[PDB]
Design a protein around this nucleic acid. Sequence first.
RNA 1: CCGAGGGUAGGGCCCGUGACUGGGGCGAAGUCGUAACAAGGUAGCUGUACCGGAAGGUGCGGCUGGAU
RNA 2: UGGGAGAGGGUGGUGGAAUUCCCGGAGUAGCGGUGAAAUGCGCAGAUACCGGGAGGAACGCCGAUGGCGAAGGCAGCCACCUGGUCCACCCGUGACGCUGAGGCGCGAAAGCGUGGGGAGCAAACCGGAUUAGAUACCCGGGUAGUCCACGCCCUAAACG
RNA 3: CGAUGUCGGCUCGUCGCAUCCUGGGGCUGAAGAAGGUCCCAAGGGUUGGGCUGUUCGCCCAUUAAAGCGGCACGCGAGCUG
RNA 4: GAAUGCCGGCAUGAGUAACGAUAAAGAGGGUGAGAAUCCCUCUCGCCGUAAGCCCAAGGGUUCCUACGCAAUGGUCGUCAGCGUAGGGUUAGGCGGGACCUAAGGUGAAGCCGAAAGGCGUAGCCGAAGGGCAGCCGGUUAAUAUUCCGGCCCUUCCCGCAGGUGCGAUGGGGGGACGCUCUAGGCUAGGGGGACCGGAGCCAUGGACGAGCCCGGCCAGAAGCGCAGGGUGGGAGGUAGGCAAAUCCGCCUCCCAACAAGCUCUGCGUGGUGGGGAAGCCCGGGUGACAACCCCCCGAAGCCAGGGAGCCAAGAAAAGCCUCUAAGCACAACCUGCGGGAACCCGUACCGCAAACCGACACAGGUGGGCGGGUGCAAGAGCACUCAGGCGCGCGGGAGAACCCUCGCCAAGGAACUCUGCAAGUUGGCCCCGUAACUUCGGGAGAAGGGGUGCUCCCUGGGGUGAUGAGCCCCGGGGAGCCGCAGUGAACAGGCUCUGGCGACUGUUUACCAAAAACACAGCUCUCUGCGAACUCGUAAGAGGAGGUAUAGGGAGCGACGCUUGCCCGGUGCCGGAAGGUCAAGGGGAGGGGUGCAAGCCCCGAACCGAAGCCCCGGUGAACGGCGGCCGUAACUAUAACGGUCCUAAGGUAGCGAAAUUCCUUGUCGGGUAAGUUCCGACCUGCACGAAAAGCGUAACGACCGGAGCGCUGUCUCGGCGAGGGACCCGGUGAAAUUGAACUGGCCGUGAAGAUGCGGCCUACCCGUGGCAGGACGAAAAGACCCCGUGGAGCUUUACUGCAGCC
RNA 5: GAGCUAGCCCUGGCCAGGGUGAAGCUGGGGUGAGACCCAGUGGAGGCCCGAACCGGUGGGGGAUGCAAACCCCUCGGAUGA
RNA 6: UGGUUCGUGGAGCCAUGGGGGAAUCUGGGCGGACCACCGCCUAAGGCUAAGUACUCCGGGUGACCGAUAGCGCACCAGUAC
Lengths: 48, 275
Amino acid sequence: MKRTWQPNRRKRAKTHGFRARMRTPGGRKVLKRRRQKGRWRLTPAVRK
Amino acid sequence: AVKKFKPYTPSRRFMTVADFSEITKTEPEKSLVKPLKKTGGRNNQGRITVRFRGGGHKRLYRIIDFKRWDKVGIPAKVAAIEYDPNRSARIALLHYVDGEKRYIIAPDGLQVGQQVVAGPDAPIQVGNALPLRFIPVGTVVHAVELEPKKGAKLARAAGTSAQIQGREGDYVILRLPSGELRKVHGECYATVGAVGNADHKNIVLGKAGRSRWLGRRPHVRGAAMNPVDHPHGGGEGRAPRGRPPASPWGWQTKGLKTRKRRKPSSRFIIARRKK
RNA sequence: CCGAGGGUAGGGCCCGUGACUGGGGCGAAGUCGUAACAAGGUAGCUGUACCGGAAGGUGCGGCUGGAU
RNA sequence: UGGGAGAGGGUGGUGGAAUUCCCGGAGUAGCGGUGAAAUGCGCAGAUACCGGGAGGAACGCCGAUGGCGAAGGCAGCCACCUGGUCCACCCGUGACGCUGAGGCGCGAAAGCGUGGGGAGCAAACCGGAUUAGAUACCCGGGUAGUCCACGCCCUAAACG
RNA sequence: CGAUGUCGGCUCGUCGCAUCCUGGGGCUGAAGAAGGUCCCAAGGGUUGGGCUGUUCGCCCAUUAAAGCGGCACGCGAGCUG
RNA sequence: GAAUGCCGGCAUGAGUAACGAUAAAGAGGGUGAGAAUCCCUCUCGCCGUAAGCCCAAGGGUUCCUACGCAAUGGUCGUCAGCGUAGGGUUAGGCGGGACCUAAGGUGAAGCCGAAAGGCGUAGCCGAAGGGCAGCCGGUUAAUAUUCCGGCCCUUCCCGCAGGUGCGAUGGGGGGACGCUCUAGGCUAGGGGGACCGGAGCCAUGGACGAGCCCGGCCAGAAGCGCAGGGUGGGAGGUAGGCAAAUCCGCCUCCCAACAAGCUCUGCGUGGUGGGGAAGCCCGGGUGACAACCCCCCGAAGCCAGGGAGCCAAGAAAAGCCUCUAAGCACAACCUGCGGGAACCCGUACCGCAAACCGACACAGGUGGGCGGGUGCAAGAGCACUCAGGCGCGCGGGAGAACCCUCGCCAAGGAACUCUGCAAGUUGGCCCCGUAACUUCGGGAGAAGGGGUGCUCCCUGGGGUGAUGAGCCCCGGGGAGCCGCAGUGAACAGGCUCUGGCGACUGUUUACCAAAAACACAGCUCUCUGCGAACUCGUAAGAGGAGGUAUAGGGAGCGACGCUUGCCCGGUGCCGGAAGGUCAAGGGGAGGGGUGCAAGCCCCGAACCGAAGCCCCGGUGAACGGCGGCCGUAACUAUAACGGUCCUAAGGUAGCGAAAUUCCUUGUCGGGUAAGUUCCGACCUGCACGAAAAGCGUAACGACCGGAGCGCUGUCUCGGCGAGGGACCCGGUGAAAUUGAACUGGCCGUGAAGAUGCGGCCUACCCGUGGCAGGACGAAAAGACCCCGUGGAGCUUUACUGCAGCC
RNA sequence: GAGCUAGCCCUGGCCAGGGUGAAGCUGGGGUGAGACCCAGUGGAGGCCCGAACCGGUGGGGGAUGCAAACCCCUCGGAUGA
RNA sequence: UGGUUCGUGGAGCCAUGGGGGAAUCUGGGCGGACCACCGCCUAAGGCUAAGUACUCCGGGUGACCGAUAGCGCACCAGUAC
Ligand SMILES: [Mg+2]
Ligand SMILES: [Mg+2]
Ligand SMILES: [Mg+2]
Ligand SMILES: [Mg+2]
Ligand SMILES: [Mg+2]
Ligand SMILES: [Mg+2]
Ligand SMILES: [Mg+2]
Ligand SMILES: [Mg+2]
Ligand SMILES: [Mg+2]
Ligand SMILES: [Mg+2]
Ligand SMILES: [Mg+2]
Ligand SMILES: [Mg+2]
Ligand SMILES: [Mg+2]
Ligand SMILES: [Mg+2]
Ligand SMILES: [Mg+2]
Ligand SMILES: [Mg+2]
Ligand SMILES: [Mg+2]
Ligand SMILES: [Mg+2]
Ligand SMILES: [Mg+2]
Ligand SMILES: [Mg+2]
Ligand SMILES: [Mg+2]
Ligand SMILES: [Mg+2]
Ligand SMILES: [Mg+2]
Ligand SMILES: [Mg+2]
Ligand SMILES: [Mg+2]
Ligand SMILES: [Mg+2]
Ligand SMILES: [Mg+2]
Ligand SMILES: [Mg+2]
Ligand SMILES: [Mg+2]
Ligand SMILES: [Mg+2]
Ligand SMILES: [Mg+2]
Ligand SMILES: [Mg+2]
Ligand SMILES: [Mg+2]
Ligand SMILES: [Mg+2]
Ligand SMILES: [Mg+2]
Ligand SMILES: [Mg+2]
Ligand SMILES: [Mg+2]
Ligand SMILES: [Mg+2]
Ligand SMILES: [Mg+2]
Ligand SMILES: [Mg+2]
Ligand SMILES: [Mg+2]
Ligand SMILES: [Mg+2]
Ligand SMILES: [Mg+2]
Ligand SMILES: [Mg+2]
Ligand SMILES: [Mg+2]
Ligand SMILES: [Mg+2]
Ligand SMILES: [Mg+2]
Ligand SMILES: [Mg+2]
Ligand SMILES: [Mg+2]
Ligand SMILES: [Mg+2]
Ligand SMILES: [Mg+2]
Ligand SMILES: [Mg+2]
Ligand SMILES: [Mg+2]
Ligand SMILES: [Mg+2]
Ligand SMILES: [Mg+2]
Ligand SMILES: [Mg+2]
Ligand SMILES: [Mg+2]
Ligand SMILES: [Mg+2]
Ligand SMILES: [Mg+2]
Ligand SMILES: [Mg+2]
Ligand SMILES: [Mg+2]
Ligand SMILES: [Mg+2]
Ligand SMILES: [Mg+2]
Ligand SMILES: [Mg+2]
Ligand SMILES: [Mg+2]
Ligand SMILES: [Mg+2]
Ligand SMILES: [Mg+2]
Ligand SMILES: [Mg+2]
Ligand SMILES: [Mg+2]
Ligand SMILES: [Mg+2]
Ligand SMILES: [Mg+2]
Ligand SMILES: [Mg+2]
Ligand SMILES: [Mg+2]
Ligand SMILES: [Mg+2]
Ligand SMILES: [Mg+2]
Ligand SMILES: [Mg+2]
Ligand SMILES: [Mg+2]
Ligand SMILES: [Mg+2]
Ligand SMILES: [Mg+2]
Ligand SMILES: [Mg+2]
Ligand SMILES: [Mg+2]
Ligand SMILES: [Mg+2]
Ligand SMILES: [Mg+2]
Ligand SMILES: [Mg+2]
Ligand SMILES: [Mg+2]
Ligand SMILES: [Mg+2]
Ligand SMILES: [Mg+2]
Ligand SMILES: [Mg+2]
Ligand SMILES: [Mg+2]
Ligand SMILES: [Mg+2]
Ligand SMILES: [Mg+2]
Ligand SMILES: [Mg+2]
Ligand SMILES: [Mg+2]
Ligand SMILES: [Mg+2]
Ligand SMILES: [Mg+2]
Ligand SMILES: [Mg+2]
Ligand SMILES: [Mg+2]
Ligand SMILES: [Mg+2]
Ligand SMILES: [Mg+2]
Ligand SMILES: [Mg+2]
Ligand SMILES: [Mg+2]
Ligand SMILES: [Mg+2]
Ligand SMILES: [Mg+2]
Ligand SMILES: [Mg+2]
Ligand SMILES: [Mg+2]
Ligand SMILES: [Mg+2]
Ligand SMILES: [Mg+2]
Ligand SMILES: [Mg+2]
Ligand SMILES: [Mg+2]
Ligand SMILES: [Mg+2]
Ligand SMILES: [Mg+2]
Ligand SMILES: [Mg+2]
Ligand SMILES: [Mg+2]
Ligand SMILES: [Mg+2]
Ligand SMILES: [Mg+2]
Ligand SMILES: [Mg+2]
Ligand SMILES: [Mg+2]
Ligand SMILES: [Mg+2]
Ligand SMILES: [Mg+2]
Ligand SMILES: [Mg+2]
Ligand SMILES: [Mg+2]
Ligand SMILES: [Mg+2]
Ligand SMILES: [Mg+2]
Ligand SMILES: [Mg+2]
Ligand SMILES: [Mg+2]
Ligand SMILES: [Mg+2]
Ligand SMILES: [Mg+2]
Ligand SMILES: [Mg+2]
Ligand SMILES: [Mg+2]
Ligand SMILES: [Mg+2]
Ligand SMILES: [Mg+2]
Ligand SMILES: [Mg+2]
Ligand SMILES: [Mg+2]
Ligand SMILES: [Mg+2]
Ligand SMILES: [Mg+2]
Ligand SMILES: [Mg+2]
Ligand SMILES: [Mg+2]
Ligand SMILES: [Mg+2]
Ligand SMILES: [Mg+2]
Ligand SMILES: [Mg+2]
Ligand SMILES: [Mg+2]
Ligand SMILES: [Mg+2]
Ligand SMILES: [Mg+2]
Ligand SMILES: [Mg+2]
Ligand SMILES: [Mg+2]
Ligand SMILES: [Mg+2]
Ligand SMILES: [Mg+2]
Ligand SMILES: [Mg+2]
Ligand SMILES: [Mg+2]
Ligand SMILES: [Mg+2]
Ligand SMILES: [Mg+2]
Ligand SMILES: [Mg+2]
Ligand SMILES: [Mg+2]
Ligand SMILES: [Mg+2]
Ligand SMILES: [Mg+2]
Ligand SMILES: [Mg+2]
Ligand SMILES: [Mg+2]
Ligand SMILES: [Mg+2]
Ligand SMILES: [Mg+2]
Ligand SMILES: [Mg+2]
Ligand SMILES: [Mg+2]
Ligand SMILES: [Mg+2]
Ligand SMILES: [Mg+2]
Ligand SMILES: [Mg+2]
Ligand SMILES: [Mg+2]
Ligand SMILES: [Mg+2]
Ligand SMILES: [Mg+2]
Ligand SMILES: [Mg+2]
Ligand SMILES: [Mg+2]
Ligand SMILES: [Mg+2]
Ligand SMILES: [Mg+2]
Ligand SMILES: [Mg+2]
Ligand SMILES: [Mg+2]
Ligand SMILES: [Mg+2]
Ligand SMILES: [Mg+2]
Ligand SMILES: [Mg+2]
Ligand SMILES: [Mg+2]
Ligand SMILES: [Mg+2]
Ligand SMILES: [Mg+2]
Ligand SMILES: [Mg+2]
Ligand SMILES: [Mg+2]
Ligand SMILES: [Mg+2]
Ligand SMILES: [Mg+2]
Ligand SMILES: [Mg+2]
Ligand SMILES: [Mg+2]
Ligand SMILES: [Mg+2]
Ligand SMILES: [Mg+2]
Ligand SMILES: [Mg+2]
Ligand SMILES: [Mg+2]
Ligand SMILES: [Mg+2]
Ligand SMILES: [Mg+2]
Ligand SMILES: [Mg+2]
Ligand SMILES: [Mg+2]
Ligand SMILES: [Mg+2]
Ligand SMILES: [Mg+2]
Ligand SMILES: [Mg+2]
Ligand SMILES: [Mg+2]
Ligand SMILES: [Mg+2]
Ligand SMILES: [Mg+2]
Ligand SMILES: [Mg+2]
Ligand SMILES: [Mg+2]
Ligand SMILES: [Mg+2]
Ligand SMILES: [Mg+2]
Ligand SMILES: [Mg+2]
Ligand SMILES: [Mg+2]
Ligand SMILES: [Mg+2]
Ligand SMILES: [Mg+2]
Ligand SMILES: [Mg+2]
Ligand SMILES: [Mg+2]
Ligand SMILES: [Mg+2]
Ligand SMILES: [Mg+2]
Ligand SMILES: [Mg+2]
Ligand SMILES: [Mg+2]
Ligand SMILES: [Mg+2]
Ligand SMILES: [Mg+2]
Ligand SMILES: [Mg+2]
Ligand SMILES: [Mg+2]
Ligand SMILES: [Mg+2]
Ligand SMILES: [Mg+2]
Ligand SMILES: [Mg+2]
Ligand SMILES: [Mg+2]
Ligand SMILES: [Mg+2]
Ligand SMILES: [Mg+2]
Ligand SMILES: [Mg+2]
Ligand SMILES: [Mg+2]
Ligand SMILES: [Mg+2]
Ligand SMILES: [Mg+2]
Ligand SMILES: [Mg+2]
Ligand SMILES: [Mg+2]
Ligand SMILES: [Mg+2]
Ligand SMILES: [Mg+2]
């Protein structure tokens, strides 16, 4: 049946994207942490 | 006259619709409409703040002239009477001799082809607007401003009217549609007549679907809910209320007056409503 | 082919009968009151309506076929 | 063709008396009610008195053993629309008449539907009395209704 | 109680005997036929239906008879539900 | 050595289950070390409103070619969406951007909030909506509306010529809109042709035919034609369209008006450019100088912004036209022509799926377009079939039990069972015919019945033509023929009677409940006068509502009909300027500490002092509540009647063994041979009862009872048959579970149910197909139950506090 | 975290074919005029039958599945909430 | 109201949201209610090294580990997944 992942590139960028994270104190702290952790990708890979 | 249907479906058996008899023009004035932004009962936080709204027919807002003192002494011809989805009353198209066009809410008896006017000197006839102080005591009147130059606020619903009862100083005394007796300032405009479409209240919606067309989504009883939801929620089987009948938020809802006590207009209200 | 009738199915009218139930007639040796006849002890009667253990009462309107 | 009387009918306006409630004033010990009382109302200021206002309903005197209508019925005053009827003239028509099974209309009150309206009155209903008792009569309250519009009902001691 | 699935039915049996029938017998208030009562006997047999989830029970129509109990109130890694 | 410990390795079950739709295969030839599985051929089967084709998402090289087969592929593999390498995606006109705005988002101004931040008219962003210029064919292994070819087109820059008061983010028009139904004319698409073009064929009894088979078009500027859409023209006045205006609006007059004119689009034609079958030869050649014509059907598409009707009353903004303002009028703009200029991103491939979402090459899920033919009344249904695509990535045998899915069945016909559960029956269309009851619609497809194929002959009407022929549509009458049977296959209601509940269509517990539950029109109470009440928010600000009591909030009840009684003592709500109580604060009689003092400092009575509470009244479609005992009537029984206690008042109408009745299968009646259910009644209602509504009610219901007919493998009671498994051989090869095990029966015993202890009995060693009684079999640290001064959700007149309100 | 699910908002899209035949309108009848009756026309509806589509009634199968909700048969809605 | 050991206590001190509201040394605050005395100190403006904290970084040293240890990572790890 219809499952939970239904990819949509626009949805993905507008929701978890670098600009979205930067707009908000919580998102900027996500970037602070993921940089501190050494994450190779700070934000979901998405094609555009 | 409300229009009946033969019972050829279970719902048409009781459905009645308005006759639209007074209606003479079936398309609004292009420069007098603007989109109505449908809200669903949600505020600017996105939250339902009025329950059970949404999903009705799309509507264009017709701009209504609720001032009228705006154009004193300039007469207009009643060009047409039209349907307005944003209100119960019909609306009348006015062609001012100026050449400006506006809408007003349409009084009972307005005739298309006739002429109306506003100002202290206007004939006391159906369709005209004057400050209250220049209107003969006893006359029934509609679209009343509540404070000078603030716009018509009283008696706008289909069939409603206010009556001038007396005068006192700077104020006249009105009987509101509710029967409240209230002082309204003499400088406030009112329009002579009652609002039309007086049969409006005799319409029988007839089926669930018709409330739905009106943007009125189903309403659910506190009694049909659970205690997390409502004071009347829960209990095994049906239950009586079990406490004074309450709103979802807990305030009592059979009799508890709710008008703010120390309110400045109390001074101008002579007698609270009847019945 | 038509055809007595037989068979299948659905209807109409009438008679008998039926747990139970509604009043009716009668009887009379009872209980309860006393509504009507006298101004019948609240004049009566009335169509209607609501109501009462019961005759009945009250309201609205009508009639005199009402005493003083 | 001239005239006449009349609460005949429909619509729209509109006047004063009274009752009720509200507001203001002034005043105080009761008021009200019956055969007599009681319930009730009243010092949280009633009754009685003055002024203001609101609202509904009915139109005193005129009024009659009166008038009008087919009947049911109809009553302040004004205008409009409208029926019946009588008189005089003896001008017109030329038996064109009477009654009328069916049908159609109208039909007090109560009652009913939808919507108004609601002062007084008042079924039901509460209470006080009366009484052997008193689901009554009498007293204090009181909702339909009584009023308007529209649609029903179609009864009557609708009787001379 | 770090689980022994719990009524009834179906299916499939198997055992006990305090025997329902059938076989043998004594007493009888056993003439005969038919009963009653006790004793021996478990080889086999012990019906179909209406009601109710029922087990049980009542009822219809039959029968030689329409037995009562045990097997985790036999049987859900066999079914039902 | 144990912690259902942790990590890892390796066992067991086991050569076991399985190898993923029962659409299906067979053979020959090739290749290779190796072939059921790769290539080619022929035969067979399956899909074909798809299992074919085109788009959009998402995916991201999976595309094409060469070389490979360790692993991946449920087997195999020479093959592959796999490994290696190389190639491959071409645009002014398609899509998006350099255009518009929608919700929403953001946000000069501005407002608010301890900080972070929250709002916010303009503006800006934001599309699958608006706007905007490309069609046909050819070419590559692989791209093509992109390259090529042909014919068309757009904007921008410059210039020339003619024209004109030119000029804008400002004014106006327009853009610009619903749902249902629908006209005319076209086109797409399709069917037929005795006509046209074509390689060839005459079999097996007949046919050299008006035979068979195949094809018979596509695109196209201007002009022209046909069919539609849009749109009045002139003058005068003018105070409105936040400046101006000659524009637009408004008034007047003249002319035009189901026309014309002007304008825009569709379709047809149209210079020209393309394509072009079967079959036969090896994607290509030929067919071919291919023909390229007539008739019929015909859209849901187009003309379009068409028409009518309806109520629920149906985006914006730019492009575009017009108006004028600063300005500028050697400019500028419009029209025509010419030359130049024209950027960035996407484009491969999958795309109902082996490439997307489901851990898998997963019987699931995924939006839009096309979707041929015949026949069945119609159709996107059904069957078969075209183009195209497939046989589903283990096979070969065998012909047990058992299981699945399926076919038939003597006599019976519900006897089955909780229950006709399941399966039969019925089944489309045309015609006849059709009850109670009803809200007059319905109930209704009630029920029940007849007809249904083919052949010949006669005949009626319509469309297209032309009025006729041909073609297509709708019939009527007559005479016959065959079979068991004519909707001959496939798709396609069993029906009736009678109760409960809910009026009705709807909604729900995604994944054990679809219902009598929720909702629903409708009824009532109540709050709310508008900066409304109410809701969200600390606030600002929003919703309510650009609404205004015929409206908005809350609550109960639940179409409709007839109705909705009594109790206001308690609680709630409403009303009540008296009275009682009442905090801070006011007041300051009186008193105290200290100082030599003035003084400083403290306690403090009367009295004034809110809401709330008390108190007085009202109030039920507000929370709620609606009795008991004794006696009495010509025989018994009962009690209309009297008495008495109690209460705030003692249950009205209607209904009643009920979705409520304990005793209970109450009693009586009905139906059955028999009826704990069902229907009708009765009334000592354990424990109905009037908007947590009472009693009814036509229609409705995948709701829940009870009965009957029809018909059946449900059953007596089972039998046979089919295919997919099970079984055997080749290939690949799991799982939970497992202290170890050399693991019998009885009677006992034992922590009370023993393979494991005692005594006896029985028993050679090891498997395969089967059955499920046991291993207190497996799974899950029982969910019931209790315990823990364990947890959480919920309630209230528990306690305590907080928001909110006074 | 609303790419699942729930509600709402903006903007688009979809709903074969068949049946029933409301109002209205025209005509006829009727009457003083009417109401109203009949016919034809018309095409209404939380109307009917039924695909797509949306569901999930009853049963069977599945149950270390094809699948952590599927499959077959049956069945509800299908111009509307 | 907070701070302090100070939880309303005999509750001062420091701070301050509300109200009221001075003075300039003969001014003012303080020494734990208050008063007197005796003392201490100068509010309502600002700055100020060092001695103190930490360890991303470099070095030195271990009765520290030695690939199930030691950092999650000795290895291309905040990776694969
Ligand atoms: Mg999706
Ligand atoms: Mg996207
Ligand atoms: Mg997108
Ligand atoms: Mg998105
Ligand atoms: Mg982002
Ligand atoms: Mg990196
Ligand atoms: Mg992130
Ligand atoms: Mg109606
Ligand atoms: Mg009607
Ligand atoms: Mg109906
Ligand atoms: Mg109905
Ligand atoms: Mg109207
Ligand atoms: Mg009207
Ligand atoms: Mg419109
Ligand atoms: Mg506009
Ligand atoms: Mg708006
Ligand atoms: Mg917003
Ligand atoms: Mg709300
Ligand atoms: Mg809402
Ligand atoms: Mg209106
Ligand atoms: Mg209306
Ligand atoms: Mg209504
Ligand atoms: Mg609406
Ligand atoms: Mg509502
Ligand atoms: Mg509700
Ligand atoms: Mg409920
Ligand atoms: Mg619930
Ligand atoms: Mg919640
Ligand atoms: Mg709570
Ligand atoms: Mg609660
Ligand atoms: Mg409750
Ligand atoms: Mg309860
Ligand atoms: Mg409940
Ligand atoms: Mg319960
Ligand atoms: Mg209950
Ligand atoms: Mg409940
Ligand atoms: Mg309760
Ligand atoms: Mg209640
Ligand atoms: Mg209660
Ligand atoms: Mg005010
Ligand atoms: Mg015979
Ligand atoms: Mg009497
Ligand atoms: Mg008497
Ligand atoms: Mg008398
Ligand atoms: Mg009595
Ligand atoms: Mg009485
Ligand atoms: Mg009379
Ligand atoms: Mg006093
Ligand atoms: Mg004469
Ligand atoms: Mg006569
Ligand atoms: Mg009458
Ligand atoms: Mg009357
Ligand atoms: Mg009456
Ligand atoms: Mg008389
Ligand atoms: Mg246990
Ligand atoms: Mg276990
Ligand atoms: Mg066990
Ligand atoms: Mg004998
Ligand atoms: Mg025996
Ligand atoms: Mg034996
Ligand atoms: Mg039994
Ligand atoms: Mg029993
Ligand atoms: Mg015998
Ligand atoms: Mg057992
Ligand atoms: Mg058992
Ligand atoms: Mg089981
Ligand atoms: Mg069992
Ligand atoms: Mg077991
Ligand atoms: Mg077993
Ligand atoms: Mg077991
Ligand atoms: Mg079994
Ligand atoms: Mg140990
Ligand atoms: Mg274990
Ligand atoms: Mg383990
Ligand atoms: Mg372990
Ligand atoms: Mg472990
Ligand atoms: Mg095995
Ligand atoms: Mg196995
Ligand atoms: Mg498997
Ligand atoms: Mg199959
Ligand atoms: Mg091979
Ligand atoms: Mg091989
Ligand atoms: Mg091949
Ligand atoms: Mg991927
Ligand atoms: Mg390619
Ligand atoms: Mg390989
Ligand atoms: Mg291999
Ligand atoms: Mg592999
Ligand atoms: Mg392999
Ligand atoms: Mg596989
Ligand atoms: Mg090779
Ligand atoms: Mg592959
Ligand atoms: Mg190009
Ligand atoms: Mg540019
Ligand atoms: Mg923009
Ligand atoms: Mg766009
Ligand atoms: Mg083109
Ligand atoms: Mg290419
Ligand atoms: Mg518009
Ligand atoms: Mg649009
Ligand atoms: Mg065709
Ligand atoms: Mg063609
Ligand atoms: Mg002007
Ligand atoms: Mg060719
Ligand atoms: Mg050639
Ligand atoms: Mg149109
Ligand atoms: Mg806008
Ligand atoms: Mg020009
Ligand atoms: Mg650029
Ligand atoms: Mg590019
Ligand atoms: Mg491409
Ligand atoms: Mg593929
Ligand atoms: Mg699919
Ligand atoms: Mg698709
Ligand atoms: Mg995969
Ligand atoms: Mg596969
Ligand atoms: Mg798949
Ligand atoms: Mg067919
Ligand atoms: Mg068909
Ligand atoms: Mg296959
Ligand atoms: Mg075999
Ligand atoms: Mg048989
Ligand atoms: Mg039978
Ligand atoms: Mg039979
Ligand atoms: Mg049954
Ligand atoms: Mg069939
Ligand atoms: Mg019948
Ligand atoms: Mg009927
Ligand atoms: Mg039939
Ligand atoms: Mg034939
Ligand atoms: Mg088939
Ligand atoms: Mg059917
Ligand atoms: Mg029936
Ligand atoms: Mg029952
Ligand atoms: Mg229902
Ligand atoms: Mg329901
Ligand atoms: Mg009902
Ligand atoms: Mg209902
Ligand atoms: Mg419903
Ligand atoms: Mg559940
Ligand atoms: Mg569920
Ligand atoms: Mg769940
Ligand atoms: Mg399920
Ligand atoms: Mg469910
Ligand atoms: Mg259902
Ligand atoms: Mg529910
Ligand atoms: Mg409900
Ligand atoms: Mg109702
Ligand atoms: Mg705001
Ligand atoms: Mg607003
Ligand atoms: Mg409003
Ligand atoms: Mg409900
Ligand atoms: Mg009835
Ligand atoms: Mg009470
Ligand atoms: Mg009370
Ligand atoms: Mg209480
Ligand atoms: Mg003192
Ligand atoms: Mg109580
Ligand atoms: Mg209550
Ligand atoms: Mg007696
Ligand atoms: Mg009573
Ligand atoms: Mg009973
Ligand atoms: Mg019984
Ligand atoms: Mg009952
Ligand atoms: Mg009960
Ligand atoms: Mg019982
Ligand atoms: Mg019982
Ligand atoms: Mg018995
Ligand atoms: Mg039963
Ligand atoms: Mg039962
Ligand atoms: Mg009894
Ligand atoms: Mg309730
Ligand atoms: Mg109930
Ligand atoms: Mg239903
Ligand atoms: Mg149902
Ligand atoms: Mg069988
Ligand atoms: Mg067979
Ligand atoms: Mg077989
Ligand atoms: Mg077989
Ligand atoms: Mg072998
Ligand atoms: Mg061993
Ligand atoms: Mg043991
Ligand atoms: Mg033992
Ligand atoms: Mg042993
Ligand atoms: Mg041993
Ligand atoms: Mg032995
Ligand atoms: Mg076993
Ligand atoms: Mg064992
Ligand atoms: Mg076992
Ligand atoms: Mg545990
Ligand atoms: Mg445990
Ligand atoms: Mg436990
Ligand atoms: Mg326990
Ligand atoms: Mg404790
Ligand atoms: Mg303890
Ligand atoms: Mg605890
Ligand atoms: Mg707790
Ligand atoms: Mg409040
Ligand atoms: Mg849209
Ligand atoms: Mg549809
Ligand atoms: Mg109608
Ligand atoms: Mg019409
Ligand atoms: Mg429908
Ligand atoms: Mg339907
Ligand atoms: Mg189908
Ligand atoms: Mg199902
Ligand atoms: Mg079934
Ligand atoms: Mg199963
Ligand atoms: Mg499962
Ligand atoms: Mg299926
Ligand atoms: Mg079906
Ligand atoms: Mg529906
Ligand atoms: Mg349907
Ligand atoms: Mg339908
Ligand atoms: Mg529907
Ligand atoms: Mg202390
Ligand atoms: Mg302190
Ligand atoms: Mg301060
Ligand atoms: Mg000093
Ligand atoms: Mg200080
Ligand atoms: Mg000090
Ligand atoms: Mg000091
Ligand atoms: Mg220093
Ligand atoms: Mg320092
Ligand atoms: Mg070392
Ligand atoms: Mg290692
Ligand atoms: Mg490291
Ligand atoms: Mg590690
Ligand atoms: Mg490591
Ligand atoms: Mg790595
Ligand atoms: Mg990572």
